[PDB]
Amino acid sequence: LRIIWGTNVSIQECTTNFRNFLMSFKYKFRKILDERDEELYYIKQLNEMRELGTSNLNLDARNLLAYKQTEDLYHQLLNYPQEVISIMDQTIKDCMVSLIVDNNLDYDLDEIETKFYKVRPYNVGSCKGMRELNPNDIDKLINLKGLVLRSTPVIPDMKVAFFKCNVCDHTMAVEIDRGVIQEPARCERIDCNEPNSMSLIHNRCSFADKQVIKLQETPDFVPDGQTPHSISLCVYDELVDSCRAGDRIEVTGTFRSIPIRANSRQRVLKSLYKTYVDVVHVK
Amino acid sequence: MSAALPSIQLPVDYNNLFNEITDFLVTFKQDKGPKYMAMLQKVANRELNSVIIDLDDILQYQNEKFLQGTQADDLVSAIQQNANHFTELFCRAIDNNMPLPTKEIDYKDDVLDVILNQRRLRNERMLSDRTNEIRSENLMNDALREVVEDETELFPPNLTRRYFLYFKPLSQNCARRYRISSKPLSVRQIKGDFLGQLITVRGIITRVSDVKPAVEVIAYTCDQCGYEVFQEVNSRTFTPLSECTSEECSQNQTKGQLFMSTRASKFSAFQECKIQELSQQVPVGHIPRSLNIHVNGTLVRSLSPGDIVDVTGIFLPAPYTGFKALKAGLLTETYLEAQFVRQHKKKFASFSLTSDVEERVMELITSGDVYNRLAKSIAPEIYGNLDVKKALLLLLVGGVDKRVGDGMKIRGDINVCLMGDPGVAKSQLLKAICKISPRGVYTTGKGSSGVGLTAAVMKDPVTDEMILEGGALVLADNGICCIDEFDKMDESDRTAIHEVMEQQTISISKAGINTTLNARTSILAAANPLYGRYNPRLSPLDNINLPAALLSRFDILFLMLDIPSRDDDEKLAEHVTYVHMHNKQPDLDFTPVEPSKMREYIAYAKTKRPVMSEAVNDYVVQAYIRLRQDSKREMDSKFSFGQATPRTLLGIIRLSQALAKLRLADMVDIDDVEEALRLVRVSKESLYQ
Numbered sequence A: 001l002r003i004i005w006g007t008n009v010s011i012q013e014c015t016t017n018f019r020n021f022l023m024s025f026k027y028k029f030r031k032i033l034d035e036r037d038e039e040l041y042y043i044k045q046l047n048e049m050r051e052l053g054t055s056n057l058n059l060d061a062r063n064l065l066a067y068k069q070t071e072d073l074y075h076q077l078l079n080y081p082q083e084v085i086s087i088m089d090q091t092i093k094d095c096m097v098s099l100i101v102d103n104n105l106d107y108d109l110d111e112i113e114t115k116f117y118k119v120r121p122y123n124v125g126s127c128k129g130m131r132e133l134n135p136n137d138i139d140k141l142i143n144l145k146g147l148v149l150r151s152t153p154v155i156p157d158m159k160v161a162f163f164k165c166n167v168c169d170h171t172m173a174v175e176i177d178r179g180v181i182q183e184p185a186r187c188e189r190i191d192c193n194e195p196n197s198m199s200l201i202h203n204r205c206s207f208a209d210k211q212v213i214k215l216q217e218t219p220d221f222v223p224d225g226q227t228p229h230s231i232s233l234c235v236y237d238e239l240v241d242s243c244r245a246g247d248r249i250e251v252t253g254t255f256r257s258i259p260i261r262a263n264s265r266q267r268v269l270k271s272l273y274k275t276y277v278d279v280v281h282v283k
Numbered sequence B: 001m002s003a004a005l006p007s008i009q010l011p012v013d014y015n016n017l018f019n020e021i022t023d024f025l026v027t028f029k030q031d032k033g034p035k036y037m038a039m040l041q042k043v044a045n046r047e048l049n050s051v052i053i054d055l056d057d058i059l060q061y062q063n064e065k066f067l068q069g070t071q072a073d074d075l076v077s078a079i080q081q082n083a084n085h086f087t088e089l090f091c092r093a094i095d096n097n098m099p100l101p102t103k104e105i106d107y108k109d110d111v112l113d114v115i116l117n118q119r120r121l122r123n124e125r126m127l128s129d130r131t132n133e134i135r136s137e138n139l140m141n142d143a144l145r146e147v148v149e150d151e152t153e154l155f156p157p158n159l160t161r162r163y164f165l166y167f168k169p170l171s172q173n174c175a176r177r178y179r180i181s182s183k184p185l186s187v188r189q190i191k192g193d194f195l196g197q198l199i200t201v202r203g204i205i206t207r208v209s210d211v212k213p214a215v216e217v218i219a220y221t222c223d224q225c226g227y228e229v230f231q232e233v234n235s236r237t238f239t240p241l242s243e244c245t246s247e248e249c250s251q252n253q254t255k256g257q258l259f260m261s262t263r264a265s266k267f268s269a270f271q272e273c274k275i276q277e278l279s280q281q282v283p284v285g286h287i288p289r290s291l292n293i294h295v296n297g298t299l300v301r302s303l304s305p306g307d308i309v310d311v312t313g314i315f316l317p318a319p320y321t322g323f324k325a326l327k328a329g330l331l332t333e334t335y336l337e338a339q340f341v342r343q344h345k346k347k348f349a350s351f352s353l354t355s356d357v358e359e360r361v362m363e364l365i366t367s368g369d370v371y372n373r374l375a376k377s378i379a380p381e382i383y384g385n386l387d388v389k390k391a392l393l394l395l396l397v398g399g400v401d402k403r404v405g406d407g408m409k410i411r412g413d414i415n416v417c418l419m420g421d422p423g424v425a426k427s428q429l430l431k432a433i434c435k436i437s438p439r440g441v442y443t444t445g446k447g448s449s450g451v452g453l454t455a456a457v458m459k460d461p462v463t464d465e466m467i468l469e470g471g472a473l474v475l476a477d478n479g480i481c482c483i484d485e486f487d488k489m490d491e492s493d494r495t496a497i498h499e500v501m502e503q504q505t506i507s508i509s510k511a512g513i514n515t516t517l518n519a520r521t522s523i524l525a526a527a528n529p530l531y532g533r534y535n536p537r538l539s540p541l542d543n544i545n546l547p548a549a550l551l552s553r554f555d556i557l558f559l560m561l562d563i564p565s566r567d568d569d570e571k572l573a574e575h576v577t578y579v580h581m582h583n584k585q586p587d588l589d590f591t592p593v594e595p596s597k598m599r600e601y602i603a604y605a606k607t608k609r610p611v612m613s614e615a616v617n618d619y620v621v622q623a624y625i626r627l628r629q630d631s632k633r634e635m636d637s638k639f640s641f642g643q644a645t646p647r648t649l650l651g652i653i654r655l656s657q658a659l660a661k662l663r664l665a666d667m668v669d670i671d672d673v674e675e676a677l678r679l680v681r682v683s684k685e686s687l688y689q
């Protein structure tokens, strides 16, 4: 038995449990879910995707809730999404390859070896918008129904940083780890050392697209007393210019918190945190 | 120099008041079993999250000591002081004696309850290995186990704290019974030097922030150690403890970096509000000044704007002084940390039935004639006219909200006007219904009423966001809005009102505001004709200045106008002189019901969702056609007013629903609509006098 710290997740046990579902689902919600022909319900949609290049796997989360063997998982991806979706990125690639090796096939191999697959889980339960999102709900899957009032310009955000060395003709690169660029003081000594002389070059670096969107949020019920909230939310690459002003939307993502700098002078941070949604899917 | 920090001592002795608490939490059965232990089993069941401690039990616990000759060493006179000590030490005992978990840890549970479980488990394994390694190193529990505890370093019990702890005071009843602790003080009366004390204050909650997380502890991760670093955050601000303080890097050359974890960081739900002084408690000539209240944890949504509350809590300094020059040293701001709340007009949404509230409903019913009993019990301080006051009870119960299941909604609510001449009191009825209505609100013709009936937009003082601030129709919702001097309003006011009677929403499209906004308000209006009094030579469509399109949104209008008379004015002059001779109301074989119990009865009736019989369905139709045929074909001359409409048929239905709800009846009789039609017609038969 293996387990993640602070967490109820076993990698291999979830890995096999997701495959067991992925290779056996057939609309059991119609049978089981409530008082409401097909077969291989996802395998058709996976063997659909591989010729189209559409790397996205849009997932109806409630498939799992009704199904016999992954009630053990619905309440995990809902509550540990950053880690449980990081598992799905791997399992689906291995579960694509099982459909290679069982097939006499052309060279799909030479790219899907390297390319990356992802999940967008959207079909989750309802919530009273921002308001019911007490801090126990931090870092969980969530959805919002509402509309857009404005969207910012696209923001450049660092993903590989680059370092240029004022001497001796070697540069350096470092990948960002969880919000920091640990810039080496040492000149990559084995070439030679100079203590502090190295540069950081903007236009060599590799950037994500980022975008921020302002959502007027409109719950299915609101308490007596309330007024509309302008939530602020962020969307990453492959969703930028997906949705824009006046659209009426269901969106899902992770509810988050972040500090704010009090001023442009010094690193004192406000203790009363700011909150937002990191979007993972928009319907 | 021990003359610095000079030693002093005082009658308190916390080192044995903790010894008192450790009995009280287990030694109380005056109200499963030792209830605090069973409550802590529900924490060990993980089915509740907040602990409420009442002084009501501590006092009668000391009596079970004192009357047995056993020293009290009073907690209560201490606890009304200095509660920030007790509230962070009284909770330590509970960590040290609570039941073990019974419903075993499972996926369908709140995610924080496994994170804490894992650290609590890891805590014990560290003791279990270190003891065995010490024992294995070539050589008694109380000897050894203290070595393990000191050599280890562990998660603290405040960071494994499953729950939030709060206090409530003891009411005056328990202060005079067995013969202080909680006068509900005025914000003016607080006189400053109460800092530290547990106090009760009451007033209007004018303004609140939204709830957001505010951190109490920051958790930091260090890879090269693997040890976590926890920083307690106490002030408004912090600086990141980036330089790794770990016990493994301190005696090490490299001092490797660390990163914050934004779920291991213990938060709390933070909210705050202003209470403004309660106006009748303001002195002569003075102003309703304001106080700032801070909230933490499970209590957070118990405060909503535009309501009157007792707040009980601990009154404390904050470090602020002005701006440096406007200073005379060591000044403090002050705030109240809220602990428990009760509110004098209650939320209808909480209404469940328990051993004391059902009998308060039942004893009201069994005298019978309840509908007429409550009408006369509304505003009995003004004479007669029961038909008006009898309809005001229906305005409260309001009928039924209908959703078509197909994208349509129609108002389950009553909108009424009280047209008349001077001297037959209006604002007293408006004011009486503002008190009897939770979330009731009172308004006036002129001045601010453009914004005052609308969303403002405001840069929120405590946090860097804009908020819509609700005018009367939004400060009220699911409740009554009272309008006075009505026709002295203006087109910009009416065109806000006219939409709200028709439907539950408002819409705005100027400047930074583009929203559609939920009103859900009942409008009860007082208005006067063009000449104060009526003129009998003027037809009502000309006597009344209001346009009949807006008037058709009043489901009843009352032509509540006076005519002098020899007899009827005599009984009035008795009632007024009687009630002016003394507060008491007439010596009828009646009692005017206490309003709070009537509020409970209404809150039960609101739960009822009555259905119309086909017998009345076909009767309502035929009465409507005869009304509409008469109203059109005959009544368009002389005293005739208006026209019959679909809307007045829906009015009769909503009124007929309201009557059936006041019966507490699951169905609507033929006996109901023959009363509803009477109120519709009788409101204008006054005109023939």
Ligand SMILES: Nc1ncnc2c1ncn2[C@@H]1O[C@H](COP(=O)(O)OP(=O)(O)O)[C@@H](O)[C@H]1O
Pocket: B381, B382, B383, B421, B422, B423, B424, B425, B426, B427, B428, B572, B576
């Ligand atoms: N029928 C009545 N019974 C008892 N008090 C009355 C009655 N009519 C008038 N009053 C007294 O007169 C005052 C009512 O003023 P009011 O007529 O409401 O002003 P407005 O002209 O704005 O309606 C109240 O203070 C009330 O005490």
Ligand SMILES: [Zn+2]
Pocket: A165, A166, A167, A168, A169, A187, A192, A194
């Ligand atoms: Zn160099």
Ligand SMILES: [Zn+2]
Pocket: B222, B223, B224, B225, B226, B227, B244, B245, B246, B248, B249, B256, B258
């Ligand atoms: Zn460290």
